[PDB]
Swiss-Prot record:
Disruption phenotype: Essential for growth, it cannot be disrupted. PknB depletion in M.tuberculosis results in cell death and aberrant cell morphology, and leads to complete clearance of the pathogen from the host tissues using the murine infection model. Residues 1-272 are extracellular. Residues 2-68, 69-136, 137-203, 204-272 form the PASTA domain. This is Serine/threonine-protein kinase PknB. Autophosphorylated. Dephosphorylated by PstP. The lineage of its organism: Bacteria, Bacillati, Actinomycetota, Actinomycetes, Mycobacteriales.
Length: 272
């Protein structure tokens, strides 16, 4: 006959709080089901389940249908070199709306994704499109080790790398003239190909002078002139000192057999 089960008053059409409050007061329990987006029944009670409207035992669980606000996704982080995973991630994020832009960038960002133009840690809508920019187009390269090679070879190596602008600075060195001492920037330094690279060149500024010891100046003179000597000649006073000194070279300031300065300055003396 009459059910000892109790029919539970419904209060749908108001709010979740009021509905739950009524049931909770009576000792009933509820189950709340959330669904993302408000295109489906809002979090406020518009409808309920007739379980409560039926005679049930006091202390049952009534299901309430709730929806949560608009769906947005926070953008997952991905390795910049892994564009495939990046696009995958936007796709797995719902929207899957992405653009790929290439921009000439600083050498370190070239070759990989730099990020997204909109904030990549923040939320984007499922209808929102994210433009992703990848660094492309380098005009920078790292200069190789170039020391011990000739200037001609050095400039050639630099030109091969695309460094068309070079300048060579020659400084005196024990190292022979022509050997590249090194470069202004060290090896491995990434620089623009359109930059002017400085090749520092060893300048020996020395050439070996042949023996002229104990000979006559009548021999010394044509020999020096013949070898293309052009410097400063020290001819002092003519001194009659005897046979040992007659037109004989007394000493040669730069020792025979070694390298003499680029000037070639020879100090020699003869008597008369």
């Amino acid at each position: 006959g009459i059910t000892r089960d109790v029919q539970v008053p419904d209060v749908r059409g108001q709010s979740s709080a009021d509905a739950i409050a009524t049931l909770q007061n009576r000792g009933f329990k509820i189950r709340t089901l959330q669904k993302p987006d408000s295109t489906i029944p809002p979090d406020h009670v518009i409808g309920t389940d007739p379980a409560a409207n039926t005679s049930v035992s006091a202390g049952d669980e009534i299901t309430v249908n709730v929806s949560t606000g608009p769906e947005q996704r926070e953008i997952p982080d991905v390795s910049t070199l892994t564009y495939a995973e990046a696009v995958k991630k936007l796709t797995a994020a719902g929207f899957g709306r992405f653009k790929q832009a290439n921009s000439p960038s600083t050498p370190e960002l070239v070759g990989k994704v730099i990020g997204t133009n909109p904030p990549a840690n923040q939320t984007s809508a499922i209808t929102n499109v994210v433009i992703i920019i990848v660094g492309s187009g380098p005009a920078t390269k790292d200069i190789p080790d170039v020391a011990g090679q000739t200037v001609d070879v050095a400039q050639k190596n630099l030109n091969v790398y695309g460094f068309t602008k070079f300048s060579q600075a020659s400084v005196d060195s024990p190292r022979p003239a022509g050997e590249v001492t090194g470069t202004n920037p060290p090896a491995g330094t990434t620089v623009p190909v359109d930059s002017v690279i400085e090749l520092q060149v060893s300048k020996g500024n020395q050439f070996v002078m042949p023996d002229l010891s104990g000979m006559f100046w009548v021999d010394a003179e044509p020999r020096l002139r013949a070898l293309g000597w052009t410097g400063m000649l020290d001819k002092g006073a003519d001194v009659d000192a005897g046979g040992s000194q007659h037109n004989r070279v007394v000493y040669q300031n730069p020792p025979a057999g070694t390298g003499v300065n680029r000037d070639g300055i020879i100090t020699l003396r003869f008597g008369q």
